[PDB]
Structure formats: structure tokens, C-alpha cells
Ligand binder design. Sequence first.
Ligand code: LUM
Ligand code: MG
Length: 277
Amino acid sequence: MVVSIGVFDGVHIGHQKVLRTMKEIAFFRKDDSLIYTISYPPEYFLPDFPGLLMTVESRVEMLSRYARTVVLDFFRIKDLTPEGFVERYLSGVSAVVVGRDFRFGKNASGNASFLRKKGVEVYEIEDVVVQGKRVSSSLIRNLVQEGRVEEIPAYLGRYFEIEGIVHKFPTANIDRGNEKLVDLKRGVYLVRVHLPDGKKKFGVMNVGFRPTDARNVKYEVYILDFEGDLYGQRLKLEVLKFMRDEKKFDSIEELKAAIDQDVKSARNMIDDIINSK
Ligand SMILES: Cc1cc2nc3[nH]c(=O)[nH]c(=O)c3nc2cc1C
Ligand SMILES: [Mg+2]
């Protein structure tokens, strides 16, 4: 099979390059296509990891739009020798498509080189470069932490997204799940809210330390022109623009005022977008 192998956290434009190339290679080699997505990169378990751009589930759903997608369980492959990885995951595979410096097996002893020696052809995909920077999940995770959401589409191929369930003064508190995900810079954001039933609304989302565990961040959105409790429902939010830093108000009024100011600003932004016919 022609098999793409990588993490693909975020499925950014560099990943899309790998996947499109795999499909073309599959077409001319007349082989089938398969994407192996490693559940977590090794850095994920280290203390300073910023967090994934999205859950593995969201990721697989996106990868699946390109080809059959199989998750490689980090815990199941980290200890394998290069030999055992090939024997167990690449039997009958004649070609793999991976990014440069791809590594595998315990102590990262496996590489494209080793694969070629086992008769596998390896197509190493060069990184995609955007405005002088190499597109990578790390770069995108850093933009999220710096709240630089308008610059994200040029690297990710779309706006950064926050996703989760509600709950678990009307705002929807988004539970993003139990996976370690990158957090947006604390503050207020203009968001496009994809509700269930296909409706799309705009929202003003606040991101703030709500300690209650420490690097614990809360995501609550005030959806514009929408009532009805989405409590228990799944939401997806495109993070469009950083509006203002988080603030420490001195009691239920200047907050209200600040919020009112956020919505007002949002309304103006939306109206600007609309007028850009
Ligand atoms: C819905 C909403 C809640 C907020 N909570 C907030 N809470 C807080 O302690 N500081 C803030 O700056 C803040 N901003 C908010 C902005 C919005 C739009
Ligand atoms: Mg061969």
C-alpha cells in the first residue's frame, strides 16, 4: 500500500502536501492509499508541550477526507524495534510517504534509510514554507498561545478551532475533552460559531484562567443572535480575531460594561465583513 505516516496534528498545509502527494503516488503506482496517524508525538508527554491543535478524533475525521485512516497507538509502537514496526505495520507495503527526518521505533533508530533497506520506497516530503517560515504544528501551536489567530490560516489552511460540549449571564462554556490541547492566549476573541443543525452564528469568546489544577483555562462564548441552551451539545468555534486581553474587573458592572463593549466591537467587525460584500 502507499502509506502516509506521521502525526498530522492540525492537518496543516504541510500535512495536506504529504497527503495529496500520497494520493498521486498511489494513483500512478496503482496501489491503494492509507494514512497512519500516530496518536501522539513523543514531545506530547514532556512537561512543556503546548498541547495538540485538536483531538485525535477531530484529526482522524479530517484525515479521513483524504484516505482510509488508521491510528497508530503511541503506547503500542514506542517500544518496537525498527524491524518490528515494519513487520507489524508495513507488511506488503511497498511505498511510504513521510516528512523529512521521519523517525520510528525505540530510541528513534528507524528512519527512511532503514525502510529503503527493507525494500520499502520512501517519498520524503519537503516542508511547505510560508512567508519565510516552515509550516509545522509547533509553529501553529505557538501562534495560538500568542493569540495570533488571524495569521493562522496561512499555515493551517483554515482558522484555528476550539471544539467541545457545553457545560458538563448566558454564555456557553465549552468542555474541550480530556486530551492535552493547546490553549489560546487569555483574552476575548471574535468567533464564528458552528451550532448543531448547520446554523452559523458569531460569538464573543472569552479565554481566561479559571484555575480551579492550574494551567486550567476556561472557554466560554456569548453567541450573538441566539438563545436556547446548547447545554450538552457539541460546538465548534472558528477563532477569528483577538479582541482584547483578559481583565481583572472590580465587580459585576465594569465587567458587564466591558462585555457590552466586546459585543459592540464584534457587531462592528461583522458588519465590516458583511460590507466587504
Ligand atoms: C462572555 C465574556 C466573559 C468574560 N469574562 C471575563 N472575566 C474576567 O475575569 N475578565 C475578563 O476580561 C472577561 N472578559 C469576558 C469577555 C466576554 C465576551
Ligand atoms: Mg521495493
